[PDB]
Amino acid sequence: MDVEAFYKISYGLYIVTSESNGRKCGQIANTVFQLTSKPVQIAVCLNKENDTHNAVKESGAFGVSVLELETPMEFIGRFGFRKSSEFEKFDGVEYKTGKTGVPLVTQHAVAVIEAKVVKECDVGTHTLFVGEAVDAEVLKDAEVLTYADYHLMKKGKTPRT
Amino acid sequence: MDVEAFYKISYGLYIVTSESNGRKCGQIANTVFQLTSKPVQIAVCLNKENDTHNAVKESGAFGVSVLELETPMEFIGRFGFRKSSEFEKFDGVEYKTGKTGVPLVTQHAVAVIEAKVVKECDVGTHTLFVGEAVDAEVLKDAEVLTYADYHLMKKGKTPRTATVYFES
Ligand SMILES: NC(=O)c1ccc[n+]([C@@H]2O[C@H](COP(=O)([O-])OP(=O)(O)OC[C@H]3O[C@@H](n4cnc5c(N)ncnc54)[C@H](OP(=O)(O)O)[C@@H]3O)[C@@H](O)[C@H]2O)c1
Numbered sequence A: 001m002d003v004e005a006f007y008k009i010s011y012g013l014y015i016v017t018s019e020s021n022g023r024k025c026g027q028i029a030n031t032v033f034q035l036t037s038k039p040v041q042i043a044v045c046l047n048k049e050n051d052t053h054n055a056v057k058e059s060g061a062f063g064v065s066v067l068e069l070e071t072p073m074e075f076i077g078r079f080g081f082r083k084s085s086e087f088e089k090f091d092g093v094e095y096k097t098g099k100t101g102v103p104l105v106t107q108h109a110v111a112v113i114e115a116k117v118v119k120e121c122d123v124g125t126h127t128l129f130v131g132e133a134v135d136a137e138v139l140k141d142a143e144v145l146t147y148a149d150y151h152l153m154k155k156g157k158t159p160r161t
Numbered sequence B: 001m002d003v004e005a006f007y008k009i010s011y012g013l014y015i016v017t018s019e020s021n022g023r024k025c026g027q028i029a030n031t032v033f034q035l036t037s038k039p040v041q042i043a044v045c046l047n048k049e050n051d052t053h054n055a056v057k058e059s060g061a062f063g064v065s066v067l068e069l070e071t072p073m074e075f076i077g078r079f080g081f082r083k084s085s086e087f088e089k090f091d092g093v094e095y096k097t098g099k100t101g102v103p104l105v106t107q108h109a110v111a112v113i114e115a116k117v118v119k120e121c122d123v124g125t126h127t128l129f130v131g132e133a134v135d136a137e138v139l140k141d142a143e144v145l146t147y148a149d150y151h152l153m154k155k156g157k158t159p160r161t162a163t164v165y166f167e168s
């Protein structure tokens, strides 16, 4: 089995957020997808080792920020290469509080979505949370960043509108 | 709540296949994603009213063909009918059969993945099938077709994969 075949699967790039016990958590995730339309349900798959996973497990709510094409790599690293409980990821970033109580990061976001968890599907190393959308807003007219784009950025390439 | 925000989520375009009661089934789908790496697990979300949904639930296996950017619309159309015979879907289509028994469509595919269902997550109108990948292969050196590209091209417009430029 050639693991490189899985590189061919397409994804967006997002920040998945939640808050539990006054602790704001956020992580980068590429595994975010809409599952149904009646009602609108969005799934996020988070590693059980993540602080954001535990915040979602406890609070039963999560936010999703869809990242824009021009999101800086340091912003991606702020959320994707350290733990929320060990580094204040939200200090220095613009965000607001959703109707569910989750922090919705507006900085570099084309849109934000907040959802309440209605089902958890354990898949081993990760938990697939199924959330029913409670609110969603489009914030910018910018192009979205894809996971494939991010891999081109990793190679030193930079987006040019 | 602005529904347009949900259209900002990215997806690929795939043919999800299965075989049940000696009949090959296939359906276009955009909701296919890798859940885990240890072991590799792939999720596919299918509407309960689709024949492929039932084929996967019965057989416990599925295949995924990742479509190339240049896939003709007529080919995609073969796998998008609510009701169509096996011959209507597969006649003249290049495919091979994996150890799980599912037909792996290789035509217009950049890669194919074969999986055995290990868990089902019922989400109401759809079932999210969690499959443990048993095989996977890269077949071509071509760009993938994203769901957004598909929608653009369908309307005779240039793909995003062509409107965005990366500077080395
Ligand atoms: N939990 C999840 O669903 C999930 C999904 C993705 C990543 N992650 C985690 O996120 C962090 C950063 O991951 P990452 O995305 O930077 O990579 P990574 O998963 O750590 O991949 C390591 C290397 O594999 C190659 N590679 C992997 N995926 C590729 C792709 N889609 N396209 C092209 N090359 C690919 C590249 O090799 P070369 O650079 O040598 O070409 C890349 O540097 C890591 O801690 C990783 O474990 C978690």
Ligand SMILES: Cc1cc2nc3c(=O)[nH]c(=O)nc-3n(C[C@H](O)[C@H](O)[C@H](O)COP(=O)(O)O)c2cc1C
Pocket (backbone or CB within 6 Å): A013, A025, A026, A027, A028, A029, A030, A031, A032, A045, A046, A047, A049, A050, A051, A052, A053, A076, A079, A080, A081, A082, A083, A084, A085, A126, A150
């Ligand atoms: C490009 C990229 C994509 C990622 N995708 C996911 C994902 O889909 N699911 C996941 O659980 N972690 C994913 N991660 C890893 C988390 O963002 C990372 O482990 C983060 O440090 C977790 O933070 P937390 O402990 O504060 O939740 C990704 C990281 C990067 C850089």
